């Protein structure tokens, strides 16, 4: 939060400070982050579909799947090749081709392949499985390199003809990883967040980071919480209190219905962006929320609205996801 990805030194003992751990509290600062890096470097790919462990190399030319298939794989790859020619062309500078197919006692080869890639390149890893923690804890080599997780879980088998659907899944993932990484680098170089710490559906995380740093420059305690969907209050929040109980379960919304037969014309309208307009527009009471945080959040939302007006897709997505972040207790810095 305080330092960010844009790291630099102002020592003006660098060797002595890198043989051991460089201390940061005395010397730290964040530089500008308009462009993170000009990326030209390999990628890795390890995937799992609940025994469907899969691997692929950007600079490799073979595909082997752990325990008719080859022809279907080739034809499907070619088909989606012509159907996404444009996307492949525009993301070739990120990831670039037919590759050898293989369908492979066999469960120890993950360690061998990880070691082989370890000595073959220094290549970011993309992970896609419902058991990311299990894979990390059963392959000791995976902690030795930076990795980016793309968990899209809840994938199941149709009990029949799983080969075509799984082929479609793997090929679309392979040919959409370029767009994925383009979007990820956009979000990272926009929000000053490291690549490995990001995720496609972690909108709440950026909200937390930006709001937390804006409060840190302010004189407001963060009430930051981890591994618990409750605001931090010094431990008092563990106790049961009546008013908290009633504000937790007060979730019903009223409505108006006036029955009858109407001969006059009636128009049907829809109302949208209600919550954002409600937020932006507008001692004695103990149940009131802090005024300072409310003002800061209103200003942040206003600047996001202004930036999204000036053709920023990321700001638009943030504005759309703000309400879902507010409702969701899983997000950190959440207060009922």
């Amino acid at each position: 939060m305080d330092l960010g990805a844009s790291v630099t030194f102002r020592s003006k003992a660098l060797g002595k400070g890198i043989q051991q751990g460089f201390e940061m509290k005395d010397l730290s600062m964040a530089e500008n982050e308009r462009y993170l890096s000009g990326f030209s470097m390999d990628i890795g790919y390890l995937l799992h579909f609940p025994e469907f462990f899969s691997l692929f190399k950007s600079w490799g030319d073979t595909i082997t799947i752990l325990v008719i298939n080859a022809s279907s794989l080739g034809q499907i790859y070619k088909q989606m090749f012509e159907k996404k020619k444009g996307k492949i062309e525009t993301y070739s500078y990120l990831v670039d081709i037919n590759f050898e197919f293989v369908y492979f006692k066999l469960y120890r080869r993950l360690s061998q392949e990880t070691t082989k890639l370890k000595e073959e390149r220094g290549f970011l890893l993309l992970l896609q499985s419902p058991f990311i923690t299990k894979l990390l804890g059963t392959i000791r080599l995976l902690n030795q390199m930076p990795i980016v997780k793309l968990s899209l879980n809840e994938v199941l088998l149709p009990q029949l003809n799983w080969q075509p659907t799984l082929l479609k899944k793997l090929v679309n993932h392979v040919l959409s990883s370029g767009s994925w990484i383009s979007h990820l680098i956009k979000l990272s170089q926009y929000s000053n967040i490291p690549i490995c710490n990001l995720r496609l559906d972690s909108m709440d995380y950026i909200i937390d980071v930006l709001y937390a740093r804006k409060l840190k420059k302010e004189n407001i305690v963060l009430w930051w919480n981890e591994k618990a969907p409750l605001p931090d209050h010094g431990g008092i929040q563990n106790d049961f209190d009546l008013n908290t109980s009633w504000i937790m379960n007060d979730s019903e919304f009223p409505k108006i219905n006036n029955s009858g037969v109407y001969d006059n014309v009636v128009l049907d309208v829809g109302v949208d962006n209600l919550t954002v307009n409600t937020i932006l527009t507008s001692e004695f009471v103990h149940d009131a929320f802090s005024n300072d945080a409310l003002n800061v959040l209103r200003g942040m939302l206003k600047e996001w609205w202004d930036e999204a007006l000036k053709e920023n897709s990321t700001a638009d997505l943030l504005v759309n996801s703000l309400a879902s972040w507010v409702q969701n207790p899983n997000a950190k810095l959440f207060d009922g």
Binding site: P229, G235, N238
Partner: protein, 548 residues
């Protein structure tokens, strides 16, 4: 029958059965009894109808077994069951019970006697909603607690001076008195004492309290002071919690009532008591007690992290050689409370909770001796499935539900003896009463201590003295810990238990004893790069071990 059974004619055997069962002892022989006796004279064909003593003595043994069950004027299809008992009459005897199936007993202030209360399930339908308590239950819960405390106080040797009800303090002033009741904050925000008669105010500016107690709102207190009618202030000068009593003295007031009835129970029709087999079971327990050991672990063994699993595997490696009699795991089994998941992209928290116990079944596969010889006990933690669904990890209802069956469909099949109970659970040994209760105590009593205007082993002494003198597991009002209206009797310490398994993750380990009872204070399952668990010898001795 015998090796050579001969089918009888019922009319000719009728006189032999009828005489014994209708003139000496017993009454109203049915047809089922006669048919049974036909079969079991087939089992006694030896010279019978010409051999008296054998069949007659079998019949008198039958009567001596039958007449101890209810009144037994009729012989239904149980007769074959008592005959199987006769055949079988020619470690067990211990029970574990939860707060859900504890018998209800009211207390009457006008009759000074406990009164049995029928359970809603046994007599009611219970198919739609039978677990919902009635409205007056919460009205009478505090009345029951106050009545029990009043009786306990007035049974004391020193008190034979007498207290005065609150309402009798209106007409006097400048006179010292003595009184007791609930302590709380009035609507205005002042300190008040509440009694069934009424309530008054408290002056604290010159109070000298008895040290060693956690003076907390919701606790019975004895107040000595001077009334003043100029305002409404009862100027307090001294304050002390009521004293406690041992098990035998409180028991003898009701002889030995069948509260935790294993040998026999009482119900609406009759009241039952027993002391004859108490000494026999005490003598039985005095022997081979070292062989029947039960070991408990720490609190909050999260089944998600690798370190806890590795330590648990090492513990089971040491333990599988010598399986104990009972094994208890206490605390939460998941480090994060389970609740509504707003995203379907990732693993559902309920599915993760189901997955965590599945691996435990796999780890049981390599410790077959433990799985075969030792029963297993699981006690829910603060942020397990049902509570965290609405409490979200905070304190909630105390009579907590057991672990749901749908998430434990494999542990029951691998192990042969697993029991899930409520957070407060009571087991009945041969001559011992053991209770287990898992929650946070030291922090609660530290944060809510009353303030008085004016080495860590002393804190646990104060905690034990307070919890044992109050005589209630939850000396807190309905504001702090909401309690189900009817089940409050489960939390009562009426005839205090032999041993208390009081686990608090915020307190150091202790093995103290006081007032005929002893208390064990297990800590967290792990601490400071180490893990520990404790075992208690039924001979009033404790051991501590650490395996990292």
């Amino acid at each position: 029958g015998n090796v050579l059974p001969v089918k009888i004619q019922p009319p000719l055997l009728r006189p032999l059965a009828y005489r014994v069962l209708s003139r000496k002892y017993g009454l109203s022989i049915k047809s089922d009894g006669l048919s049974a006796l036909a079969e079991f004279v087939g089992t006694n064909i030896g010279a019978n109808w010409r051999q008296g003593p054998a069949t007659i003595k079998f019949l008198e043994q039958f009567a001596a077994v039958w007449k101890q069950q209810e009144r037994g004027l009729f012989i239904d299809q149980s007769g074959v069951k008592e005959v199987i008992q006769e055949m079988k009459e020619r470690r067990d005897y211990f029970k574990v019970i939860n707060a859900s199936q504890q018998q209800r007993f009211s207390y009457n202030p006008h009759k000074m006697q406990f009164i049995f209360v029928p359970n809603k399930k046994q007599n009611g339908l219970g198919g739609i909603a039978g677990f919902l308590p009635d409205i007056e239950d919460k009205v009478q819960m505090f009345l029951t607690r106050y009545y029990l405390t009043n009786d306990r106080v007035m049974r004391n040797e020193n008190f034979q001076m007498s207290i005065t009800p609150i309402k009798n303090l209106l007409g006097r002033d400048a006179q010292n008195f003595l009184l007791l009741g609930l302590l709380n904050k009035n609507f205005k925000g002042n300190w008040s004492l509440e009694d069934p008669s009424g309530s008054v105010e408290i002056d604290i500016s010159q109070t000298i309290p008895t040290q060693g107690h956690y003076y907390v709102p919701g606790c019975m207190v004895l107040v000595e002071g001077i009334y003043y009618s100029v305002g409404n202030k009862f100027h307090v000068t001294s304050m002390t919690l009521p004293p406690g009593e041992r098990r035998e003295i409180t028991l003898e007031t009701i002889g030995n009532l069948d509260l935790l009835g294993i040998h026999g129970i009482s119900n609406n029709n009759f009241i039952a008591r027993l002391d004859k087999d108490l000494k026999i079971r005490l003598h039985l327990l005095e022997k081979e007690l070292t062989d029947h050991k039960f070991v408990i672990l720490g609190a909050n063994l999260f089944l998600d992290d690798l370190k806890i699993m590795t330590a648990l595997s090492k513990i089971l490696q040491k333990l599988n050689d010598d399986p104990p009699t009972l094994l208890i795991w206490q605390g939460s089994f998941t480090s994060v409370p389970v609740f509504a998941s707003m995203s379907s992209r990732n693993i559902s928290s309920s599915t993760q909770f189901k997955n965590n116990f599945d691996a435990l079944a796999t780890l049981l596969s390599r410790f077959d001796n433990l799985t075969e010889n030792t029963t297993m006990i699981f006690i829910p933690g603060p942020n397990d499935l049902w509570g965290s669904m609405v409490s979200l990890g905070a304190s909630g209802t105390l009579p907590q539900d057991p672990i749901p069956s749908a998430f434990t469909k494999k542990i029951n099949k691998v192990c042969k003896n697993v029991v899930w109970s409520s957070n407060p659970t009571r087991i009945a040994y041969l001559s011992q009463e053991i209770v287990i209760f898992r929650d946070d105590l030291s922090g609660r009593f530290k944060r809510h201590r009353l303030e008085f205007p004016f080495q860590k082993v002393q804190e646990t002494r104060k905690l034990v003295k307070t919890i044992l003198d109050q005589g209630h597991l939850s000396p807190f009002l309905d504001s702090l810990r909401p309690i189900s209206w009817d089940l409050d009797h489960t939390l009562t310490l009426c005839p205090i238990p032999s041993t208390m398994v009081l686990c608090d993750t915020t307190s150091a380990q202790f093995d103290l004893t006081y007032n005929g009872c002893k208390v064990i204070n297990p800590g967290s399952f792990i601490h400071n790069r180490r893990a520990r668990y404790m075992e208690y010898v039924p001979s009033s001795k404790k051991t501590i071990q650490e395996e990292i």
